[PDB]
Amino acid sequence: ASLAIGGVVIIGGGGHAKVVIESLRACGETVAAIVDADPAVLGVPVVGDDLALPMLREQGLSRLFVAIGDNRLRQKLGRKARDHGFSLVNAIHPSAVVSPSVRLGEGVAVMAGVAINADSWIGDLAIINTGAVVDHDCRLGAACHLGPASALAGGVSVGERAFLGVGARVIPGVTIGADTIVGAGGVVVRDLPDSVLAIGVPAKIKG
Amino acid sequence: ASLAIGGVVIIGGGGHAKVVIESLRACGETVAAIVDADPAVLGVPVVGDDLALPMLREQGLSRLFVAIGDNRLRQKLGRKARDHGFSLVNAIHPSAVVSPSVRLGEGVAVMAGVAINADSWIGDLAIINTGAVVDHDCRLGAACHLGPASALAGGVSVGERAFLGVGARVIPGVTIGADTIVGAGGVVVRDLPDSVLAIGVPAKIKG
Amino acid sequence: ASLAIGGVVIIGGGGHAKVVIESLRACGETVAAIVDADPAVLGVPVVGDDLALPMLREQGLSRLFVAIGDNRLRQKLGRKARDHGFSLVNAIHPSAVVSPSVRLGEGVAVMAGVAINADSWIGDLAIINTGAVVDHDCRLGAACHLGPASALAGGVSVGERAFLGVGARVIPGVTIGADTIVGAGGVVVRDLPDSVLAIGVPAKIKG
Ligand SMILES: CC(C)(COP(=O)(O)OP(=O)(O)OC[C@H]1O[C@@H](n2cnc3c(N)ncnc32)[C@H](O)[C@@H]1OP(=O)(O)O)[C@@H](O)C(=O)NCCC(=O)NCCS
Ligand SMILES: CC(C)(COP(=O)(O)OP(=O)(O)OC[C@H]1O[C@@H](n2cnc3c(N)ncnc32)[C@H](O)[C@@H]1OP(=O)(O)O)[C@@H](O)C(=O)NCCC(=O)NCCS
Ligand SMILES: CC(C)(COP(=O)(O)OP(=O)(O)OC[C@H]1O[C@@H](n2cnc3c(N)ncnc32)[C@H](O)[C@@H]1OP(=O)(O)O)[C@@H](O)C(=O)NCCC(=O)NCCS
Ligand SMILES: C[C@H]1O[C@H](OP(=O)(O)OP(=O)(O)OC[C@H]2O[C@@H](n3cnc4c(=O)[nH]c(N)nc43)[C@H](O)[C@@H]2O)[C@@H](O)[C@@H](O)[C@@H]1N
Ligand SMILES: C[C@H]1O[C@H](OP(=O)(O)OP(=O)(O)OC[C@H]2O[C@@H](n3cnc4c(=O)[nH]c(N)nc43)[C@H](O)[C@@H]2O)[C@@H](O)[C@@H](O)[C@@H]1N
Ligand SMILES: C[C@H]1O[C@H](OP(=O)(O)OP(=O)(O)OC[C@H]2O[C@@H](n3cnc4c(=O)[nH]c(N)nc43)[C@H](O)[C@@H]2O)[C@@H](O)[C@@H](O)[C@@H]1N
Ligand SMILES: [Cl-]
Ligand SMILES: [Cl-]
Ligand SMILES: [Cl-]
């Protein structure tokens, strides 16, 4: 496991990691290595599992991204990475449009084709996936995930670890609780509590 | 109310105004002032209500944008602005793709991530909101509003002041009447008359 | 029918052709001529029907695009063009984001605002229409058509000549058979066989 000086360490080596790697390279960043629970991905070597993090830090790598789709796991691994002395970078594709009044956390993925409008706040470890739209004055909690082609109208709040499937939509002013799942294509027209699953047009809670 | 020379006056100081301000600045335009019925927004001073328009014109400002979401109101205020001697500019985000055969009116908002294809006609005071798609040979009436992430297939006609909610879709060749509302996520598969509300997949008129 | 040296020949002169012409011009390509079964389109001369292909080749034109929406017809005309000695170019709008690990066939249309992510494979004569999203590890069969604003999540396979209408969505890992149609707005949550029509949220086969 000999590595170049100064690139980004990736936690996770799956399909999401592939996209993240390409976003980072599109920005001229170098990806140093992957750590994966199954101890290459688009040419990036897998050097071990998370027990390899101290070794990576020791050799001077200090920048990291958590490329894990599962929200609760991603959040846990981000904490672990920070404990081990890594800084969480953001992976923002060059094609994404992020308004200058947007507040970004750390460890955030913003994929190709995204637009994020004025005065939106994006928590640590959020994923804003390919082609998603976030309108003005939105609030995205830590470790939430807006799936590909999803869209939030203005003033929408998304709780920690919530997940919106491909093409989900939320109308203005709606609040979605922590740990909630909106199925693919769901159209959310009223506030959703924590820890529910909602599907359909309009979205309805499924027990 | 002392102002710089030569920028754009904005009617409206809400969330839509924020997005419009950022589109204009992204193009290197200067925003001079806001007039708002409640007499700053992202650093632009609110100088009064619409009774301040003559004063603004008198001091040499002549370029204006109406950043009001409500379609009928926007249309009325655009007329008022023109009567007071202002020219209505367009607010086209740099990231929008507007085909070279598109005909644009005046006072049109075209947000980040939009694509508008060949031989489409876009009426005065239309809003083409964030990430929306307008396919070839479309006709958008004055003061209509295509909401974020909405999409029109080819040959679609949208009447004056119609409103398509977040993620609405229209199949090829459909005509939607003036003053009609398509709810968020509605999928329009047949012509809609004037002054109706249609929701669902497929969209159905709700009395 | 006198033509400049070296441009692209277009089969088809309809609305799709208009969009394709503009994509090619946006890349600095020249469009030489159209052949259309009704023997100009945005300034490109219509020189005859497909019986004019040998004459075009004879005068030195060797690059061609098939701008025909109907998938089975497009596929047949692509074969005819190749038999007549033409190379099928791709028509990729400058604004499209095509990952560097994507495999592209020939005769592929990739419209404005598209994003295609890592390790996706795109067959000959596919159409990836305006604003569509193709996530990582997707497989698009020859002559399929992803309509405007459609979206595929990760690991989706689309069979030859399949058609997804405006705003259709497919969840991860789903396979859609050859010659299948997903209606506008359909949300595909399970594999679809060949030669079916599926509509709704979730999409259901209609006999
Ligand atoms: C809603 C969802 C979470 C349900 O998953 P699940 O509980 O494993 O459900 P199943 O696949 O077993 O389907 C259960 C039922 O839900 C229906 N259903 C599934 N997904 C649906 C959706 N998105 N909208 C409406 N109905 C849906 C099914 O048709 C089935 O109905 P039945 O009881 O009549 O058959 C899932 O289908 C989904 O939408 N995932 C989105 C994933 C995504 O986009 N990932 C992108 C990542 S980047
Ligand atoms: C359709 C719409 C206009 C209805 O507004 P409203 O009449 O105030 O309706 P309500 O919120 O009181 O809901 C009334 C009913 O319609 C249903 N409904 C609401 N919006 C719906 C939609 N978009 N699709 C399907 N059903 C919808 C509700 O579930 C409720 O059903 P019930 O009678 O079983 O409860 C609205 O919900 C909508 O879609 N707005 C889109 C706004 C938008 O996108 N703005 C972005 C601006 S840039
Ligand atoms: C599904 C589709 C193929 C059906 O076409 P069709 O069989 O000619 O159907 P019709 O227009 O005669 O409508 C038949 C019925 O299907 C319903 N329907 C039509 N399209 C529907 C859709 N996309 N989703 C749900 N229901 C739909 C109709 O409401 C009607 O219902 P009814 O029997 O209660 O009236 C078509 O409406 C469609 O979605 N086309 C998408 C085209 C597209 O996007 N082109 C873009 C090209 S770039
Ligand atoms: C955002 C996306 O989320 C999902 O992508 P994903 O890349 O996270 O999922 P997978 O392709 O299954 O890959 C998960 C990877 O995550 C690894 N992994 C799983 N658990 C751990 C962990 O504890 N530590 C580390 N270092 N790695 C772990 C797995 O061993 C595996 O290689 C899929 O649902 C995609 O369809 C979706 N694009
Ligand atoms: C396009 C969008 O439309 C809506 O946005 P919006 O910015 O128009 O709406 P609001 O945030 O309520 O702001 C409306 C603003 O418009 C002002 N206003 C309302 N009436 C007038 C008027 O007559 N003249 C002037 N000069 N201003 C007027 C209000 O006092 C208020 O500041 C919301 O529904 C957003 O969610 C949506 N993005
Ligand atoms: C991708 C899109 O597909 C469809 O567009 P399209 O451009 O193929 O369809 P149309 O506008 O009817 O044009 C089809 C053109 O295709 C021509 N055509 C049809 N059959 C042939 C053929 O055999 N050879 C040649 N050379 N041309 C043929 C027709 O004479 C006509 O000019 C429409 O459904 C659009 O709404 C959609 N954007
Ligand atoms: Cl690298
Ligand atoms: Cl300014
Ligand atoms: Cl040309």
Strands B197-199 and B204-205: antiparallel
CB contact under 8 A, A137 and B15: yes
d(CA C163, CA C176): 10
CA of B42 to the centre of ligand 8 (A): 9
According to the annotation, is A186 in a ligand binding site?
no
CB contact at 8 A, B144 and B124? no
Helix (H, G, I), strand (E, B), or coil: what is residue C207? Answer: coil
Spatial separation of the C-alpha atoms in residues B77 and B75, rounded to whole Å: 5
Q: Which of residues 57-86 of B touch A (CB under 8 A)?
A: none
Residues 6+ apart with CB under 8 A from C29: C7, C8, C89
Alpha-helical runs (H) found in A69-143? 71-83
Distance between CA A158 and CA A143 in Å, rounded? Answer: 10
Q: Quick one: which atom of ligand 3 is closest to the CA of B190?
A: 11
Asked if residue A118 has its Cβ within 6 Å of ligand 4, the reply is no
Nearest CA to ligand 2 atom 2: B183
Residue type, B105: G
Angstrom distance (rounded) from CA C20 to CA C9? 11
Q: Flag if C18 and B171 touch (Cβ within 8 Å).
A: no
Chain A contact for B149 (CB, 8 A cutoff): yes
User: Residue A87 to residues A10, A158, C45: CA-CA distances in angstroms?
Assistant: 12, 25, 59
The enclosing H or E element of A60 equals none
Q: CA A136 → CA A152, A163, A180, B106, distances in Å?
A: 9, 19, 22, 23
Cβ-contact B139, B174 below 8 angstroms: no
> With left for phi above 0 and alpha for psi between -120 and 50, is residue B61 left, alpha or beta?
beta
Structure tokens at A40: 């290459």
Cβ neighbours around A94 below 10 Å, total = 10
Element at A23 (helix H, strand E): helix A15-26
- Say whether B84 is catalytic: no
The reply to whether residue C136 touches residue A166, judged by beta carbons under 8 angstroms, is no
- Across the interface, whether the CB atoms of B111 and A115 are under 8 A apart is answered yes
CB atoms within 10 A of CB C72: 12
Give C51's contacts (C-beta < 8 A, 6+ positions apart).
none
The domains of chain B are located at 1-89, 90-199
CA distances in angstroms from B138 to B123, B132, B186, listed in the order given: 11, 13, 18
Closest by CA to B156, choosing from B168, B139, B141, is B139
Which chain C positions have a beta carbon within 8 Å of B136's beta carbon?
15-16, 18-19
Going by C-beta distance under 8 Å and a sequence separation of 6 or more, which residues neighbour residue B201? A201, B185, B186, B187, C185, C200, C201
Q: Which fold has domain B1-89?
A: Rossmann fold (3.40.50)
Report cis status (omega within 30 of 0) of the bond before A202. yes
- Residue B32's alpha-carbon distances to A66, A102, B28, B59, C162, in angstroms, are 43, 22, 13, 12, 52
Give me the DSSP letters along B69-125.
S-HHHHHHHHHHHHHTT-EE--EE-TT-EE-TT-EE-SS-EE-TT-EE-TT-EE-TT
Beta carbons of A109 and A43 less than 8 angstroms apart: no
User: Do the Cβ atoms of A149 and C170 come within 8 Å?
Assistant: no
SS3 B169: strand
3-class secondary structure per residue, A127-144: EECCCCEECCCCEECCCC
Nearest to C141, CA basis, from C177, C109, C172: C177
> What is the distance between the alpha carbons of residues A45 and A109, in angstroms, rounded to a whole number?
21
**Contact flag A112-C113 (C-beta cutoff 8 Å):** no
For residue C8, the distance in angstroms to the closest alpha carbon of chain B comes to 19
Q: Using an 8 Å Cβ cutoff, are A133 and B149 in contact?
A: yes
The minimum CA-CA distance between C44 and chain A, rounded to whole Å, is: 31
Candidates B136, B167, B169; nearest CB to C19: B136
Output DSSP code: residue C202. T
* Catalytic hit among B16, B84, B93, B136: B136
Q: Is C147 on the interface with B (CB under 8 A)?
A: yes
What sections of chain C are H helices per DSSP?
Answer: 15-26, 53-58, 71-83
The domain covering A90-199 belongs, at the CATH homologous superfamily level, to Hexapeptide repeat proteins (2.160.10.10)
Residues 6+ apart with CB under 8 A from C43: none
Active site residue ranges of A: 136
Q: Does C21 touch chain B (CB under 8 A)?
A: yes
Q: How many residues are there in chain B?
A: 207
Nearest to C44 by CA among C36, C33, C55: C33
Testing ligand 2's pocket by substitution, the residue of A120, A136, A171 carrying the most ligand atoms inside 8 A of its CB is A171
A169 touches chain B (CB under 8 A): yes
CA distance A65 to A47: 15
Query: Are the CB atoms for B176 and B157 separated by under 8 Å?
Result: yes
Which ligand lies nearest to the CA atom of residue B8 in the structure? Answer: 8
Burial C25-58, CB ≥16 within 10 A → b, else e? bbeebebbbbbbeeeebbebebbbeeebbeebbe
- From atom 47 of ligand 3, which residue's Cα is the shortest distance away? C147
Taking an 8 Å cut-off on Cβ atoms, the answer to whether C130 and B118 are in contact is no
Under a CB-based contact definition with an 8 Å cutoff, are residues C202 and C188 in contact?
Answer: yes
**Neighbouring C-alpha atoms within 13 Å toward the C-beta of A50:** 18
Amino acid identity of residue A200, one-letter, is G
Query: Measured between alpha carbons, how far is B9 from A65 in angstroms, rounded to an integer?
Result: 43
What residues of chain B lie within 8 A of the CB of A153, using their CB? 147-148, 165-166, 184
User: What DSSP element (H or E) covers C93?
Assistant: none
- Partner residue opposite B153 with nearest CB, options C22, C112, C148: C148
Q: Which residues of chain C neighbour A201 with C-beta distances below 8 Å?
A: 201
Separation between Cα atoms, residue C69 and residue C61, nearest integer Å:
23
Which residues 6+ apart lie within 8 Å of C58 measured at CB?
none
- What three-state secondary structure class fits A24? helix
DSSP reduced 3-state for A206:
coil
A151 contacts on B by Cβ (under 8 Å):
131, 148-149, 166-167
A154 lines ligand 5 (CB under 6 A): yes
C51 contacts C7 by C-beta, under 8 angstroms = no
Residue by residue, DSSP assigns C116-157 as E-TT-EE-TT-EE-TT-EE-TT-EE-TT-EE-TT-EE-TT-E
The pair phi, psi for residue C19, each rounded to 5°, is -65, -45
Tokens linked to B167: 């993620």
Handedness of CA C25, C27, C30, C33 (dihedral sign): negative
Q: How far is the CA of C29 from the centre of ligand 7 (A)?
A: 33
Q: What's A106's DSSP letter? A: S
Residue type, C171: I
Determine the Cα–Cα distance for residues C19 and C68; give it in Å rounded to an integer: 11
